[PDB]
Design a protein around this ligand. Structure first.
Ligand SMILES: CC(C)CCNC(=O)[C@@H]1CNC[C@H](N2CC(=O)N(c3ccccc3Cl)CC2(C)C)C1
Ligand SMILES: *[C@@H]1O[C@H](CO)[C@@H](O)[C@H](O)[C@H]1NC(C)=O
Length: 335
């Protein structure tokens, strides 16, 4: 584990408080792509120029063309990424990727099949998985494991900062930016290495800790826009907020938004509270209009689930650092 002295930062654009993306470049000359950095997965992929134009999502995004890259190295093994809300498919390729000033030869997937739903709703073109190889598909080495191999990063960690719509957000590779957090960092260890998940001692909504009273799992997901729990949990949680469930999310009468109780997550002894302003898309104060909440149900299957997921809703309030070296996660108040 060679630790050098370079600390890179990736500037992020905040789209609707639901998607945080930055730029990376693939090949020579660089072909730029807008991507999301997802601690929830470990592969890197962008749409391919070989993607049939019958996939409208491909027509609406930047396409990587191997024929315009002199640094390209063929491979072709098929790859399928099945995410919680959709799937992408294609084949593996290799070329040089530039992220935050760092140039690393990376193996990525050239997607030739990306469904209109949900990808048509994606501002970004691709995803850059920030997880461990244990979660990587096709056994492809994650892009961070490769940067750590170049022994240039001061520290074997990276930090995320999600702003709330100046810069939309920021990722620091090799450290954290003291500019975006105050107070001390409070860490927790991962249940097991290979996944960015930690034990969660309990969840309290309002005056009663009616949820996860006997402990539960908490996944810290930078690629997730909201916070999620088992359908069972969310129904309890939403029942308590007085919210009514729609097809894909929960809402409340906008006038009722500001009166919503606080919601806390007991992580590693420290209490992480969010007021209604932190999880309600207060777009109106009218009683005659619905306001959606940044929390919904999601039943992640084992070995990972059942489990909660703390996404942008949570990270917007707490600066998050991911420590690969000591397999822990640290939180601090974001400023
Ligand atoms: C391969 C394996 C690790 C699956 C488990 N991990 C996950 O499913 C990933 C867990 N973190 C969030 C990931 N995202 C889901 C999603 O809904 N996204 C999204 C957001 C807004 C608009 C459109 C889209 Cl597609 C972005 C991605 C990064 C795909 C999936
Ligand atoms: C693709 O990469 C894998 C991983 O090392 C390698 O074993 C395989 O031979 C490559 N495919 C080809 C034939 O280029």
């Amino acid at each position: 584990l060679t630790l050098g002295n370079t600390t890179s930062s990736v500037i992020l654009t905040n789209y609707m408080d639901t998607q945080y993306y930055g730029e990376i470049g693939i090949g020579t000359p660089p072909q730029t792509f807008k991507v999301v950095f997802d601690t929830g997965s470990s592969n890197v992929w962008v749409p391919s120029s070989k993607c049939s134009r019958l996939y409208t999502a491909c027509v609406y995004h930047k396409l990587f063309d191997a024929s315009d890259s002199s640094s390209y190295k063929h491979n072709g093994t098929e790859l399928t990424l099945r995410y919680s809300t959709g799937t992408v498919s294609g084949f593996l390729s290799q070329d040089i990727i530039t992220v935050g000033g760092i140039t690393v030869t990376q193996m990525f997937g050239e997607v030739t099949e990306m469904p209109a739903l949900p990808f048509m709703l994606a501002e970004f073109d691709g995803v850059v998985g920030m997880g461990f190889i244990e979660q990587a598909i096709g056994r492809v080495t994650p892009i961070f494991d490769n940067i750590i191999s170049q022994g240039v990063l001061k520290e074997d960690v990276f930090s995320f900062y999600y702003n709330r719509d100046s810069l939309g957000g920021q990722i620091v590779l090799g450290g954290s930016d003291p500019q975006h957090y105050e107070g001390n960092f409070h860490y927790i260890n991962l249940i097991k290495t290979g996944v960015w998940q930690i034990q969660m001692k309990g969840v309290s909504v309002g005056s009663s800790t009616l949820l996860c009273e006997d402990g539960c799992l908490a996944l810290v997901d930078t690629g997730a826009s909201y916070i999620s729990g088992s359908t069972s949990s969310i129904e309890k949680l939403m029942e308590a907020l007085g919210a009514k469930k729609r097809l894909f999310d929960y809402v409340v009468k906008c006038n009722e938004g500001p009166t919503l109780p606080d919601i806390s997550f007991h992580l590693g002894g420290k209490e992480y509270t969010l007021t209604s302003a932190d999880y309600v898309f207060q777009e109106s104060y009218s009683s005659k209009k619905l306001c959606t909440l940044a929390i919904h149900a999601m039943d992640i299957p084992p070995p990972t689930g059942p489990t909660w997921a703390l996404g942008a809703t949570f990270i917007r309030k707490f600066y998050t650092e991911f420590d690969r070296r000591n397999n822990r996660i640290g939180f601090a108040l974001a400023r």
